[PDB]
Amino acid sequence: NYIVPGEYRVAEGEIEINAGREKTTIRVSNTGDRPIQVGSHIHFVEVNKELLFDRAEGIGRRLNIPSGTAARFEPGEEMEVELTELGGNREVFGISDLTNGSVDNKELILQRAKELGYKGVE
Amino acid sequence: MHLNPAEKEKLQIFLASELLLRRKARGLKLNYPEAVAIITSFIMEGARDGKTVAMLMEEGKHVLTRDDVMEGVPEMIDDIQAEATFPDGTKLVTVHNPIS
Amino acid sequence: MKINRQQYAESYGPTVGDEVRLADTDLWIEVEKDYTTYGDEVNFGGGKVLREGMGENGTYTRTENVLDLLLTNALILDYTGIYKADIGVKDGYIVGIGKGGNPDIMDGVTPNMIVGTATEVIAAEGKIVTAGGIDTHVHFINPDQVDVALANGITTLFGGGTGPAEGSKATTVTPGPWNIEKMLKSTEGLPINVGILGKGHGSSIAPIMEQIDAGAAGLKIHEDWGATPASIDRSLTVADEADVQVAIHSDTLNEAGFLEDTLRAINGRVIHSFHVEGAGGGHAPDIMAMAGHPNVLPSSTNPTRPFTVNTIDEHLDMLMVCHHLKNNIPEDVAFADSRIRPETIAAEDILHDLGIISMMSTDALAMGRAGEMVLRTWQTADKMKKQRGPLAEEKNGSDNFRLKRYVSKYTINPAIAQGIAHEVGSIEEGKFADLVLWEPKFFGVKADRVIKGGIIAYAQIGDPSASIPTPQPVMGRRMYGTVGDLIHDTNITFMSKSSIQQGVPAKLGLKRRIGTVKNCRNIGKKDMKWNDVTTDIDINPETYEVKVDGEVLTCEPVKELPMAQRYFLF
Ligand code: NI
Ligand code: NI
């Protein structure tokens, strides 16, 4: 049998990511005129202001995509994405400074998002 | 001839490629370093001839074939990268999967 | 959402159940368990996971459970298991084996493996990670030998020598307090861990013992200095008081005794038996019988490993040029022929496979190759698999049991034998971060990156004048760990307890980390991981046939080996 040095012989099956966490589908639109690409682990409510979507549905969540991959939005593009729940302590600090604490404080997160112009605060 | 550090090092790629070409001319299937040595020197020499980066990206995939090298060698080389001085300055050439 | 396993292993390295070929051998290792949380794997780069507020925690200072370095997605191959995990290092030591990341938002993060502002990242996805090799049979004869050893994944050199002096070219010995002090000072400039052996020769305790007090980390008894019953006895008395190991290369000539006399002089005390097969030295022709006793920690040197068609021709000639043997002299030919035996070299392959010889070493530059300890260990395992089949202990098509038995021979077993396994020898929490990353295609052949005390010391990397580091020529090069004063913090000089208590390091101005040799007098063959078999080895004095448990141990020499002409330019 031909030898490929260091080759893999992977087992059978598939790997399910983020297993057991609630999944959510939402429609997101890039209202900007430059492309936006969002990574798997950024708190979704804190993404670029010009992405329009129901901001409350991004709280305490992130994209449900393979760790280290990203969703891309061309200028003007609208599309559906699937979110999964953040884990661990379910706390977010920094990034856009919308949360800085538990993700359970939805009212506070949405007030900050709305004051700063993050589109789609219901 | 005011050699800098990179010029001194890249002389050794050329040495190695001369050594590998003699081994191929006496009928040997080439190994991993020999095949890399050989494709890297082709790339550098092509830049010295004034070829473009796009020409060397194509031609570097035809310098060695699987029947020139040992089993497993084609699959070990995912790409080969070399920097050389073209007519318009130093540029990077990458040859993806050079041997098939 | 699900990922097929081929893509998963492409992105994150293999996971539970997946197998990986070692270089171009026939050996396959299988991932036994995985510490990750699928979907929260750590990775670094543009738009990846270890970013502030995400997989990197932006709140914690360095002392609050944050790492200095995370190796992501490593396939660990070690005596403790073959498994997937993140490896976290802090203050130059391994502090966490598990799952790195940010407990803010990720599940299953090991509590002291937080990636924070202070963490540097090494991607190990798709690499095999092992401890650095521990070579306990080094002749210090040419400082160019250190890069040679680092390039094949060796991170600790134990042995002796003062350069190309004839005592050093023959014996791993740095004789006396002054030579030892000089070589301890020389060692400040070698980018590798080092332990120095004194001469284990003398008939009064004081001349031997003053070497230990001067800074030696153990002793070497060699037949070129007189491997007599008295030298043996005095060295082992010094060693039992000092808590250091003694290595022996016994009297090949049988001048003052036969093997049973050397054993009687040892008198049940612990001792490391070097090149136990005997081509490298030792009572002719039955020194390898030493490997059956409970108080012997047996090692092979690497030129006989494994048994090949050129081995005997090469050794006979090697022996005659080293000893300046003459063709013409019948006593020189009889000595050669009593020393270089096909019967014992073939049986040495099998005794490694059975777990009867517990360790490998090089014998660097005195009948041994400094950069081939690791290489030849895997060549032997591959030959044994082809000649003897999968061990009976194997499960699932994998060679995990054999990989753990053989990886132990050059990592943890030499560390245990020398009294330094509290510091090095394996990938465990609390041990020094000497780690070797390997692409699977080069496993055991050419190390990718060698980490010493948590900083890369040596790496296969390309043109320093290029736009990126991968353009040719890719070659082994010393990195920032070896430069300036960082060479002191990334490397350990191992020394006896008494020299440390007597303040030899401050006397000499040593700035390296000082490691303490300890706990090597009350161990035995049973303490050798995966290689703890004691048995009655019989060597026929007429035929040189080796028998264990009533069976002859024999195998054929091979014409070709993996990890050879596909990789090397010469
Ligand atoms: Ni010896
Ligand atoms: Ni030796």
Nearest Cβ partner for A15 among C2, C28, C58: C2
On the question of a cis peptide bond just before residue C440, with omega within 30 degrees of 0, the verdict is no
Residues C172, C162 contacting (CB under 8 angstroms): no
- Rounded to whole angstroms, the Cα distance separating C182 from C455 reads 27
Cα dihedral C239, C241, C243, C247 in deg (nearest 10): 0
Residues around the ion ligand 2 (C-beta < 5 A) = C 363, 366
CATH of the domain at B28: 3.30.280.10
Residues C286, C339 contacting (CB under 8 angstroms): no
- A39, C6: Cβ pair inside 8 Å? no
Nearest Cβ partner for C24 among B9, B36, B72: B72
Distance (Å) from CA A23 to ligand 2 centroid: 64
Q: Where are the domains of chain C?
A: 1-131+426-483, 132-425+484-569
Residues C520, C417 contacting (CB under 8 angstroms): yes
Q: Which ligand is the nearest neighbour of the Cα of C160?
A: 2
Q: Which two tokens stand for residue A5?
A: 């040095």
What is the DSSP-derived secondary structure letter of residue C474? Answer: P
Integer distance in angstroms from the first to the last C-alpha of chain A? 62
Cα dihedral A44, A45, A46, A51 in deg (nearest 10): 90
- Rounded to whole angstroms, the Cα distance separating C400 from A100 reads 47
Mutual angle of helices C259-266 and C229-242, in 10-degree steps: 30
Residue with tokens 């473009």: B52
CATH number of C132-425+484-569: 3.20.20.140
- Rounded to whole angstroms, the Cα distance separating C131 from C451 reads 9
Burial of B45-69, coded b for 16+ CB within 10 Å and e otherwise, reads ebbeeebebeebbebbbebbeeebb
In which element (H, E) is residue C197 found? strand C193-199
Q: Side-chain half-sphere of C188: how many Cα atoms within 13 Å? A: 14
Q: Which is nearest to C101 in space by CA: C33, C51, C45?
A: C51
In single-letter form, the type of residue at position A23 comes to: K
- C21, A5: Cβ pair inside 8 Å? yes
- C5, A64: Cβ pair inside 8 Å? no
- Rounded to whole angstroms, the Cα distance separating C460 from C485 reads 22
Q: Looking at beta carbons, which residues of chain B come within 8 Å of A4?
A: 72, 75-76
Q: Residue A44: which residues within 8 A CB-CB, separation 6 or more? A: A38, A58, A59, A61, A62, A63, A83
Q: What are C435's strand-pairing partners?
A: C131, C451
Nearest Cβ partner for B83 among C441, C466, C567: C466
Q: Residue C373: which residues within 8 A CB-CB, separation 6 or more? A: C133, C135, C152, C154, C302, C360, C361, C362, C410
Distance (Å) from CA C208 to ligand 2 centroid: 19
- Rounded to whole angstroms, the Cα distance separating C489 from C500 reads 18
Q: Which ligand is the nearest neighbour of the Cα of C362?
A: 2
What is the topology classification, in CATH, of domain A1-122?
Urease, subunit B (2.10.150)
- Rounded to whole angstroms, the Cα distance separating A91 from A108 reads 14
Distance (Å) from CA C388 to ligand 1 centroid: 30
Strands C81-90 and C93-98, sheet pairing: antiparallel
Distance (Å) from CA C176 to ligand 1 centroid: 19
Q: What are A51's strand-pairing partners?
A: A30
Subunits in contact with chain B (3 or more CB pairs closer than 8 Å): A, C
Q: Which two tokens stand for residue C310?
A: 């050129």
CA C245 to the chain's CA centroid: 16
Nearest Cβ partner for A8 among C9, C59, C566: C9
Residues B80, B43 contacting (CB under 8 angstroms): yes
| Sheet strands (E) in C48-80 | 69-78
The length of chain A is 122
| Sheet strands (E) in C124-172 | 128-131, 133-139, 154-160
- Rounded to whole angstroms, the Cα distance separating C104 from C394 reads 41
- Technique used by the depositors: X-ray
Q: Which ligand is the nearest neighbour of the Cα of C281?
A: 1
Q: Which is nearest to A25 in space by CA: A53, A66, A67?
A: A53
Q: Which two tokens stand for residue C378?
A: 């895997």
Interface with A, mutate which of B32, B36, B69, B75 (most A CBs under 10 A): B75
Distance (Å) from CA C446 to ligand 2 centroid: 24
Q: Looking at beta carbons, which residues of chain C come within 8 Å of B4?
A: 465
In single-letter form, the type of residue at position C219 comes to: L
Residues C64, C111 contacting (CB under 8 angstroms): no
What are the Cα distances from residue C275, in Å, to B66, C305, C525?
42, 11, 16
DSSP of B12-40, one letter per residue?
HHHHHHHHHHHHHHTTPPB-HHHHHHHHH
A2 touches chain C (CB under 8 A): no
Structural domain containing residue B41: 2-100
Number of domain units in chain B? 1
Residues C184, C504 contacting (CB under 8 angstroms): yes
Cβ count within 10 A of residue C469: 12
User: To the nearest 5 percent, what fractions of chain A are helix, strand and coil?
Assistant: 15, 30, 55
Q: Residue C255: which residues within 8 A CB-CB, separation 6 or more? A: none
Q: Looking at beta carbons, which residues of chain A come within 8 Å of B75?
A: 4-5, 7
What is the DSSP-derived secondary structure letter of residue C143? Answer: T
Resolution (A): 1.9
Interface with C, mutate which of A2, A3, A7, A8 (most C CBs under 10 A): A8
In which element (H, E) is residue B89 found? strand B89-96
Q: Is B76 helix (H, G, I), strand (E, B) or coil?
A: helix
In which element (H, E) is residue A63 found? strand A61-63
Q: Which two tokens stand for residue A82?
A: 């699937």
Residues C307, C350 contacting (CB under 8 angstroms): no
Q: What is the architecture of the domain spanning C1-131+426-483?
A: Roll (2.30)
Mutual angle of helices C400-410 and C342-354, in 10-degree steps: 110
Q: Which is nearest to C108 in space by CA: C163, C52, C60, C36?
A: C36
Q: Looking at beta carbons, which residues of chain A come within 8 Å of B71?
A: 2-3
- Rounded to whole angstroms, the Cα distance separating C220 from C239 reads 11
What are the Cα distances from residue C7, in Å, to A40, A82, C29, C155?
17, 20, 19, 34
- Rounded to whole angstroms, the Cα distance separating B20 from B38 reads 7
Q: Residue C526: which residues within 8 A CB-CB, separation 6 or more? A: C294, C532, C534
| Sheet strands (E) in C431-518 | 435-438, 449-452, 455-461, 475-478, 492-495, 513-516
- To the nearest whole Å, the CA of C370 is away from the closest chain B CA by 21
Q: Which two tokens stand for residue C260?
A: 């049973």
On the question of a cis peptide bond just before residue C557, with omega within 30 degrees of 0, the verdict is no
Strands C271-273 and C296-300, sheet pairing: parallel
- Rounded to whole angstroms, the Cα distance separating B9 from B22 reads 21
The length of chain C is 570
Residue C366 annotated as part of some ligand binding site: yes
What would you measure as the largest C-alpha separation in chain C, in angstroms?
79
In single-letter form, the type of residue at position C281 comes to: G
Interface with B, mutate which of C25, C439, C446, C472 (most B CBs under 10 A): C472
What is the DSSP-derived secondary structure letter of residue C471? Answer: S
Burial of A36-56, coded b for 16+ CB within 10 Å and e otherwise, reads bebbbbbbbbbbbebbbbebb
Q: Where are the domains of chain A?
A: 1-122
Subunits in contact with chain C (3 or more CB pairs closer than 8 Å): A, B
CA C90 to the chain's CA centroid: 23
C118 phi/psi in degrees, rounded to 5 = -75, 0
What is the DSSP-derived secondary structure letter of residue C34? Answer: B
Subunits in contact with chain A (3 or more CB pairs closer than 8 Å): B, C
A112 touches chain C (CB under 8 A): no
- Rounded to whole angstroms, the Cα distance separating B23 from B15 reads 13
Residues C380, C407 contacting (CB under 8 angstroms): no
What would you measure as the largest C-alpha separation in chain B, in angstroms?
42
Nearest Cβ partner for C569 among B34, B71, B92: B34
Residue C404 annotated as part of some ligand binding site: no
Q: Which is nearest to C449 in space by CA: C423, C481, C473?
A: C481
Residue with tokens 């390039």: C151
- Rounded to whole angstroms, the Cα distance separating A19 from C399 reads 31
Q: Which is nearest to C67 in space by CA: C127, C114, C18, C130?
A: C114
